[PDB]
């Protein structure tokens, strides 16, 4: 089902230069593209197809890794680069894109790199062009909704023209190689699944932490907040991958179908539940990176009711996971850039050792998705009569230094060209994720909850550290 | 106080025990097959003191102290008058014990407050261990007896129960289900020097499987005690050995393979064959391998693959628990071996724990998407650069000083070992089975290589 | 939510509108479940006004005697209508309040179903106000089934469609999930570890007599395994729904349907068996063979037998033995989960049979759940003491004497007047059912498997007992 | 060979043992050569007291087993000499009474532990002791562990442990014997027999009667010493034991002793929380008005007749699983039974629906009937508007119905035959006894320092209100049919 005609919308955007064109050339330069591939890039600004190509070369030079860069391999990729100045608002403009496009039976992959308000106009023009017709796919990587209603608004109006199979919603997460091995680690190994239940598993937690701020995306970040921005998709995907029941086989939908279910089955957070289970944290002026950094209001310059931090004790309510607290924690201006997963297991049924002897420490498996990728499992070992909880450590980066550090889109981009792709979100996953997330905002918006701030680099609001510790567990911290 | 190390003037107590004993610092009495002087025993100790940890010997004023305080005394072990030339260890052998035990006690008196450590196989047939034990227990106290397994005291052997029972993840699969087979391997690069004749009567099997490994097996297969009591531990090991599937005269043909180290190379030098070194024809098995079966609710149908040898290509000690594979491969044929997870701990050669894991390879939606096996390492001897890599024997003497057997073999344990062992012997001897020569530095007879492979399993090689 | 006062009946002339549907409806109105204000169209044209006489003939001799009463019948007789029309002719179909919902029940054949849609749309009956139910044997091939389904879908929304399987209404079939997931003892055992094989048997003493002509089309495997027995497999293997939802439960069956090991053309010689009932004894009486009863020589199976495999985490490697049969020794539908034997016999072989535990759900004619345990016989023996297998028996027929509900159909039917539809199948379910069964038929046709004769009343072809025998498994029978 | 019944005048001998022996004679499991010599403390001195034994046969033995002709064959194997354990000098009369040493002598002390030691001293003078001689004892085996040990120590000093065959009446009943067959002869249970899958265990011996003619012996001990140190504690070991490798006497025991060694100490502190005591009180029993225990005693009474405990085995398998023991006299019904409540379903797929989904339960009634059954949830049949109904149900097995044919025989006949056989299979070991004794001695001390008072319950009532609350605080209840 590979597509030899693809159209790049929003080609004027930073993402297309920053994450799209470099990924493409990276696929080119290695030969994953059928050389009979058309790529009709479209932007409002005016450039000659040879012209646009020169702009792309700048982007390729300013973004593609130097080792990949080759003046021959760039040129071979540019001769598959064709552009066409078009207004969306005017559907009559699209026909010029249509003439460039390769025959429909070969098919068209339609990337949308714009704003969700701009989505509605563009789809209409394609049908007159004929690009709207089946044999056309469609990817989306935008603020395509903040609540259900918009997402339903945006999706319902799309599903009018295409179908779910045509739609390829994309999550930057799942591009990540580390995110992907997680299914392999759980289902390529038979030790984890026996204990991957409510019994022998005590608490689990997610922490996507970053020192960076909302530098540049502020004003636009102020609309999402950490919870709309990172946890809505990115983090709930981690939960799905870690809690999903296995599919019978590695199918796009069957994999999705289990994640969809995990999204569907979770403890809802209600009005009364939110004060107990939710924590907010804005950023105080603080020194981060050894350099003093300004508060959120400092940079924002305006009153703001957005988070930057979130931390939620979620519950998966399925036979397997019912009653296992899932402790989420994301935020900016944190002590380290370290996204990580810690599964903590229930302690041994009986400590047959002396009370004096080191208290047993529950076995825990830790995976850090970013920046370093490592997998470690806690154990107890008698010391050369005492013990130390010592770790069985492994670094993926050490394991495969040679493998190329491809970009997260290079991979995502091809799945879309190749055929049905499991790394792309579905409406069923999308509606459920809002279901949980939305209420949370409405319930705590209805509760006049206002974020408790911390000085930047403080590890977040004190109110947080107690959400976990009033149940008796601590957030994993390096020592 | 005053001890007696009968056979301290020997290899047993020149590197393994007495050289290690330097750390164990009372007047020290030591018997001697080569009966030298008081100062000379210290001088002989001083050469062994030279063969000790460089830092600990250099730091110790003990080497000066050893010259300062020393005891030597014609052992006269055979003589009823073997004594007078508090606790004595029998660094002697089973033969150098029975008469030795009878006479050493009589000259200085005996009864309680006297040591009783076999420090030996202390038996050939059951009757040997039986008779020899029986005459001891009727003359000592059961608490006084300290049968010694050089291994059990080794710290790496010890953390197993902490490993096994301090960790939730290992036990759910530790079953008949969830384990495909277990694998124990005692390797040495060395041949036999000066011990071949004693070894030749004993056999490799008797020297290591009966004492060094069977305990290891218990530690690996035993059901836990309610609490970590000396007898609570031992009572559950006894349960293991007594649940060992007997090797009949029929089970020996298919389930065992004998070997013998031939002539070859070891490292950068080349060594000669075994019998030629002996100078007399030997039918002793330098190398033996067993397909032991333990039958219990937990394990019935889990093969235990034994392997200890001499002049082996490399010396390594470790256990390979290979787990029963995933009930289903949720992936396509094209990507991933999906090789079974295994837990491996190096023991005597180095202390490390590693678990086999399978991780998806960095990949793009190419036609092939393989997942590679990866291991989680812990260097038990690299994280504890603070803890002294102190010898294993040194600690056991502390337990003797306590007078509580924290780790000494029990008769009800021991008698379980021979009954199984001797059934291999009486049996395969009744079938006229003979040892197979193997090149020095190779991996025993090729008859073994087929023992592992008729099941669909292979031994463990790092490469 | 039906707002429905109108019922549509097709195929009344069949031995189904009389034996099951007409008595079923008798209950729906004789206990206040049918509105007082609340049609009969014949696949075979019949003289009219016969039905008021016909129901008394057909019902009296079909409905339960205790249930039967002179009064209840008159109201039912009045409500009933009878127009003599032909499915082949659309104009006939046109010859019914709009406000009342029209619910269309199709008790004809799959081929006749398309015509009914053809006349309804044109007669004025098909309406958003119309809900249509369809018989279980719809289609002989996935493409034929997909053909009819696609046509109905344009005419009717999926919700209006109510795909019928009578097995899903049988009480013993319904509580199967309650048995499995309302009880924690069963689930730990329900895995590749702890289950040796599952064993299903729908047994029948009666060969088709009137229906042989229509049967010869659909093999015993098509008539029963496609719908009835294949649902049983879902209930006995389906992973738990997080919550019981009509679609999620159907969704999880679909997952089970899709995880069956493909019976190709190479796995048909080894994992399937066909049979045709020869001549023998039925009730001390001599009854004739298939080919005698039906003159045309035929390769049709009056008996089938499968060794199906579910290849997921839970079930990979657990054999599934399915044996629908005609002219068999008994009418006993019965699932027999046989569990893995003790990991070790800590008991001497001489005194121990140590037979494996078996969960036997008897679905008909008697409701009788039971479990088998081995218990020591009471005697004084110094050695080799004997141990005897014993059964813990239950009787849903004896325990629920008070509940007193006669038939599955009345619940399913009433449900269509209610519009619930949880029992009714879903399209995605249907199509995964066919593709698996279609392969088994194609492989035998490509592999030229021909039914073996079995004297009528002998469990089946000798070949079945050997399909189990090679694997050590036997066919459970009361001994 | 030759049997001796020390304690011959005992009511227990009259009902439990003399009927059992008749059954062995009737079935011809008893040698014609074998002769039984009985010494009774206070009555029926004449050898023709067989009539007194025959009286015992009538009021106790089953009619079908009873056979007028068969009695005489048995009674003319009965030889009685009046003897006093306290005076050794009269032990001789038991000797000079058949008892050829080569045939050998099987000695039964239906006497109390206090009388145990004295009887042994007479036998050694009589030449009864040492070779060719066995020895049986009884359930109490001493007031305390030191008390049992002092009597114990001298037994092994006199006969080799091979020859002591201590009797725990429960171990040997067929329903008690099957337990291990239940546990390890099937694969269904053990997946869940752990601290994951189980809510709690419940062992309960109930009795409609009080103590009559047993009161003087009874007020020395108490119900826990009477039917717990030996009986109910054996049952606990069988329920919680890790399986043996293969079914050998010591292989079974060595794990049972561990279950006893595993149990957590009640201690002085836990008794307010884990111990409930009762004193049988005047009321109804059997439909009859029966007298209160103190009034029957004729003296103040500190002994329970009822106890209820929250036992804890602290091993890998059972750590933290409460075991609710409850043995009583004048309880509403006679019925020994075990109820395993399995930990409830992990999550409910039909949580919205009304039905409770009660936790599964394995019920084994050892007495008075023999029965195993299983709690399962199954959907209630209904036509449902919206919402669903689920009713719990029982999978039935009446062992007696399954094997009615095989003769039903007294546990003692199995227990006694092994004695002549010289078999220790249903006979307790000293290590078994000490572990049971230390636990009991510690609860008794805890009761002593806290001065707990048996709390009076009515006759025919479910014990004291104190016991119901101890079960209630967990949420657990007591199984009561209906
Ligand atoms: N007893 C029955 O007649 C019965 C049973 C199961 C399915 N069906 C199917 O429903 C329809 C019934 O038509 P007849 O009543 O003419 O057989 C057909 O599609 C038939 O194959 C009938
Ligand atoms: N039913 C019983 O009498 C019974 C039950 C268990 C043990 N015992 C023991 O047997 C002897 C009974 O003697 P009495 O018949 O005088 O009660 C005592 O040692 C007693 O502890 C009696």
PDB file of N, CA and C and ligand atoms in Angstrom, chain D residues 7 9-17 41 108-113 116 137-141 167 169 213-214 217 226-227 231 412, ligand 2:
ATOM      1  N   UNK D   7      -6.813 -48.433  81.799  1.00  0.00           N
ATOM      2  CA  UNK D   7      -7.906 -47.498  81.803  1.00  0.00           C
ATOM      3  C   UNK D   7      -9.182 -48.170  81.389  1.00  0.00           C
ATOM      4  N   UNK D   9     -11.894 -49.104  82.481  1.00  0.00           N
ATOM      5  CA  UNK D   9     -13.212 -48.615  82.981  1.00  0.00           C
ATOM      6  C   UNK D   9     -13.607 -47.285  82.348  1.00  0.00           C
ATOM      7  N   UNK D  10     -12.785 -46.743  81.457  1.00  0.00           N
ATOM      8  CA  UNK D  10     -13.059 -45.395  80.931  1.00  0.00           C
ATOM      9  C   UNK D  10     -14.342 -45.334  80.138  1.00  0.00           C
ATOM     10  N   UNK D  11     -15.058 -44.216  80.228  1.00  0.00           N
ATOM     11  CA  UNK D  11     -16.259 -44.050  79.376  1.00  0.00           C
ATOM     12  C   UNK D  11     -15.787 -44.062  77.922  1.00  0.00           C
ATOM     13  N   UNK D  12     -14.656 -43.407  77.648  1.00  0.00           N
ATOM     14  CA  UNK D  12     -14.144 -43.345  76.260  1.00  0.00           C
ATOM     15  C   UNK D  12     -13.839 -44.767  75.809  1.00  0.00           C
ATOM     16  N   UNK D  13     -13.243 -45.563  76.690  1.00  0.00           N
ATOM     17  CA  UNK D  13     -12.982 -46.974  76.331  1.00  0.00           C
ATOM     18  C   UNK D  13     -14.327 -47.656  76.101  1.00  0.00           C
ATOM     19  N   UNK D  14     -15.303 -47.345  76.950  1.00  0.00           N
ATOM     20  CA  UNK D  14     -16.618 -48.015  76.832  1.00  0.00           C
ATOM     21  C   UNK D  14     -17.246 -47.652  75.486  1.00  0.00           C
ATOM     22  N   UNK D  15     -17.158 -46.389  75.060  1.00  0.00           N
ATOM     23  CA  UNK D  15     -17.850 -46.093  73.783  1.00  0.00           C
ATOM     24  C   UNK D  15     -16.890 -46.061  72.593  1.00  0.00           C
ATOM     25  N   UNK D  16     -15.801 -45.308  72.705  1.00  0.00           N
ATOM     26  CA  UNK D  16     -14.835 -45.207  71.581  1.00  0.00           C
ATOM     27  C   UNK D  16     -14.072 -46.503  71.290  1.00  0.00           C
ATOM     28  N   UNK D  17     -13.591 -47.206  72.319  1.00  0.00           N
ATOM     29  CA  UNK D  17     -12.678 -48.350  72.034  1.00  0.00           C
ATOM     30  C   UNK D  17     -13.351 -49.723  72.014  1.00  0.00           C
ATOM     31  N   UNK D  41     -10.000 -49.126  86.852  1.00  0.00           N
ATOM     32  CA  UNK D  41      -9.734 -48.573  88.201  1.00  0.00           C
ATOM     33  C   UNK D  41     -10.832 -48.864  89.223  1.00  0.00           C
ATOM     34  N   UNK D 108      -2.348 -50.166  75.903  1.00  0.00           N
ATOM     35  CA  UNK D 108      -3.094 -48.900  75.716  1.00  0.00           C
ATOM     36  C   UNK D 108      -3.363 -48.261  77.076  1.00  0.00           C
ATOM     37  N   UNK D 109      -2.991 -46.994  77.236  1.00  0.00           N
ATOM     38  CA  UNK D 109      -3.203 -46.258  78.458  1.00  0.00           C
ATOM     39  C   UNK D 109      -4.374 -45.305  78.214  1.00  0.00           C
ATOM     40  N   UNK D 110      -5.595 -45.809  78.410  1.00  0.00           N
ATOM     41  CA  UNK D 110      -6.780 -44.929  78.318  1.00  0.00           C
ATOM     42  C   UNK D 110      -6.746 -44.060  79.569  1.00  0.00           C
ATOM     43  N   UNK D 111      -5.719 -44.259  80.389  1.00  0.00           N
ATOM     44  CA  UNK D 111      -5.524 -43.470  81.627  1.00  0.00           C
ATOM     45  C   UNK D 111      -5.062 -42.061  81.274  1.00  0.00           C
ATOM     46  N   UNK D 112      -5.211 -41.127  82.202  1.00  0.00           N
ATOM     47  CA  UNK D 112      -4.758 -39.728  82.005  1.00  0.00           C
ATOM     48  C   UNK D 112      -3.233 -39.674  82.058  1.00  0.00           C
ATOM     49  N   UNK D 113      -2.650 -38.570  81.602  1.00  0.00           N
ATOM     50  CA  UNK D 113      -1.176 -38.434  81.528  1.00  0.00           C
ATOM     51  C   UNK D 113      -0.597 -38.584  82.933  1.00  0.00           C
ATOM     52  N   UNK D 116      -0.286 -41.883  83.445  1.00  0.00           N
ATOM     53  CA  UNK D 116       0.570 -42.535  82.458  1.00  0.00           C
ATOM     54  C   UNK D 116       1.840 -43.075  83.106  1.00  0.00           C
ATOM     55  N   UNK D 137      -0.805 -43.940  73.977  1.00  0.00           N
ATOM     56  CA  UNK D 137      -1.105 -42.862  74.937  1.00  0.00           C
ATOM     57  C   UNK D 137      -2.406 -42.173  74.533  1.00  0.00           C
ATOM     58  N   UNK D 138      -2.614 -40.921  74.943  1.00  0.00           N
ATOM     59  CA  UNK D 138      -3.929 -40.305  74.625  1.00  0.00           C
ATOM     60  C   UNK D 138      -3.761 -38.835  74.239  1.00  0.00           C
ATOM     61  N   UNK D 139      -4.863 -38.165  73.901  1.00  0.00           N
ATOM     62  CA  UNK D 139      -4.813 -36.774  73.364  1.00  0.00           C
ATOM     63  C   UNK D 139      -4.133 -35.747  74.284  1.00  0.00           C
ATOM     64  N   UNK D 140      -4.372 -35.681  75.615  1.00  0.00           N
ATOM     65  CA  UNK D 140      -3.803 -34.590  76.423  1.00  0.00           C
ATOM     66  C   UNK D 140      -2.269 -34.565  76.505  1.00  0.00           C
ATOM     67  N   UNK D 141      -1.633 -35.715  76.740  1.00  0.00           N
ATOM     68  CA  UNK D 141      -0.148 -35.806  76.820  1.00  0.00           C
ATOM     69  C   UNK D 141       0.425 -34.682  77.683  1.00  0.00           C
ATOM     70  N   UNK D 167      -1.579 -41.173  70.329  1.00  0.00           N
ATOM     71  CA  UNK D 167      -2.864 -41.149  69.655  1.00  0.00           C
ATOM     72  C   UNK D 167      -3.441 -39.739  69.650  1.00  0.00           C
ATOM     73  N   UNK D 169      -6.833 -38.493  68.228  1.00  0.00           N
ATOM     74  CA  UNK D 169      -8.047 -39.154  67.763  1.00  0.00           C
ATOM     75  C   UNK D 169      -8.471 -38.671  66.385  1.00  0.00           C
ATOM     76  N   UNK D 213     -19.278 -36.552  83.239  1.00  0.00           N
ATOM     77  CA  UNK D 213     -18.444 -37.707  83.616  1.00  0.00           C
ATOM     78  C   UNK D 213     -17.046 -37.455  83.111  1.00  0.00           C
ATOM     79  N   UNK D 214     -16.861 -36.336  82.410  1.00  0.00           N
ATOM     80  CA  UNK D 214     -15.516 -35.948  81.927  1.00  0.00           C
ATOM     81  C   UNK D 214     -15.113 -34.686  82.678  1.00  0.00           C
ATOM     82  N   UNK D 217     -11.835 -34.643  84.953  1.00  0.00           N
ATOM     83  CA  UNK D 217     -10.618 -34.522  84.105  1.00  0.00           C
ATOM     84  C   UNK D 217     -10.640 -33.183  83.360  1.00  0.00           C
ATOM     85  N   UNK D 226      -7.921 -29.553  75.581  1.00  0.00           N
ATOM     86  CA  UNK D 226      -8.653 -30.793  75.224  1.00  0.00           C
ATOM     87  C   UNK D 226      -8.693 -30.965  73.708  1.00  0.00           C
ATOM     88  N   UNK D 227      -9.502 -30.170  73.001  1.00  0.00           N
ATOM     89  CA  UNK D 227      -9.596 -30.438  71.574  1.00  0.00           C
ATOM     90  C   UNK D 227      -8.900 -29.431  70.669  1.00  0.00           C
ATOM     91  N   UNK D 231      -5.977 -32.208  68.513  1.00  0.00           N
ATOM     92  CA  UNK D 231      -6.880 -32.373  67.384  1.00  0.00           C
ATOM     93  C   UNK D 231      -6.871 -31.239  66.375  1.00  0.00           C
ATOM     94  N   UNK D 412     -10.920 -45.115  65.476  1.00  0.00           N
ATOM     95  CA  UNK D 412     -10.100 -45.876  66.447  1.00  0.00           C
ATOM     96  C   UNK D 412      -9.760 -47.222  65.811  1.00  0.00           C
TER      97      UNK D 412
HETATM   98  N1  LIG E   2     -13.921 -39.282  74.393  1.00  0.00           N
HETATM   99  C1  LIG E   2     -12.944 -39.344  75.283  1.00  0.00           C
HETATM  100  O1  LIG E   2     -13.136 -39.747  76.439  1.00  0.00           O
HETATM  101  C2  LIG E   2     -11.560 -38.990  74.848  1.00  0.00           C
HETATM  102  C3  LIG E   2     -11.195 -38.425  73.630  1.00  0.00           C
HETATM  103  C4  LIG E   2      -9.863 -38.165  73.370  1.00  0.00           C
HETATM  104  C5  LIG E   2      -8.922 -38.478  74.334  1.00  0.00           C
HETATM  105  N2  LIG E   2      -9.288 -39.014  75.550  1.00  0.00           N
HETATM  106  C6  LIG E   2      -8.272 -39.387  76.561  1.00  0.00           C
HETATM  107  O2  LIG E   2      -8.476 -40.769  76.903  1.00  0.00           O
HETATM  108  C7  LIG E   2      -8.717 -40.903  78.325  1.00  0.00           C
HETATM  109  C8  LIG E   2     -10.219 -40.930  78.540  1.00  0.00           C
HETATM  110  O3  LIG E   2     -10.623 -41.526  79.812  1.00  0.00           O
HETATM  111  P1  LIG E   2     -12.207 -41.407  80.245  1.00  0.00           P
HETATM  112  O4  LIG E   2     -13.041 -42.432  79.484  1.00  0.00           O
HETATM  113  O5  LIG E   2     -12.256 -41.685  81.762  1.00  0.00           O
HETATM  114  O6  LIG E   2     -12.609 -39.971  79.855  1.00  0.00           O
HETATM  115  C9  LIG E   2      -7.935 -39.694  78.879  1.00  0.00           C
HETATM  116  O7  LIG E   2      -6.515 -39.831  78.912  1.00  0.00           O
HETATM  117  C10 LIG E   2      -8.356 -38.609  77.876  1.00  0.00           C
HETATM  118  O8  LIG E   2      -7.531 -37.464  77.752  1.00  0.00           O
HETATM  119  C11 LIG E   2     -10.605 -39.285  75.804  1.00  0.00           C
END
